[PDB]
Structure 1
Amino acid sequence: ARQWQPDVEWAEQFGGAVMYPTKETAHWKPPPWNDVDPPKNLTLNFGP
């Protein structure tokens, strides 16, 4: 009745870090939405 259009599952294929994931590359994480990564004062004791 209606023309097929991509669903969520069809879209999830294009959301990986790389195309055609493998065992070695399965652990790769896609870069953050903005290209900013988490970043993850000295003391002195002048004695006698």
Structure 2
Amino acid sequence: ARQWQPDVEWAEQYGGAVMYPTKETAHWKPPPWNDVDPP
């Protein structure tokens, strides 16, 4: 066998706005990649 390393499903658990989704925290899009918002 081969040592297991994370796949896309595992990594997407850390790509959200918050670790523990709830009702209030839904719709929280992650911040922009460069801290700039549309004018």
Q: Does TM-score exceed 0.5, indicating one fold?
A: yes
Corresponding pairs, count:
39
Q: Equivalent pairs: percent with the same residue? A: 97
| TM-score with structure 1 setting the length | 0.76
Structure 2 unaligned spans of 5+: none
Q: Which is greater in Rg?
A: 1
Give the aligned CA root-mean-square deviation in angstroms: 0.6
Runs of 4+ in 1 over 4 A off after TM superposition: none
Structure 1 unaligned spans of 5+: 40-48
| TM-score with structure 2 setting the length | 0.91
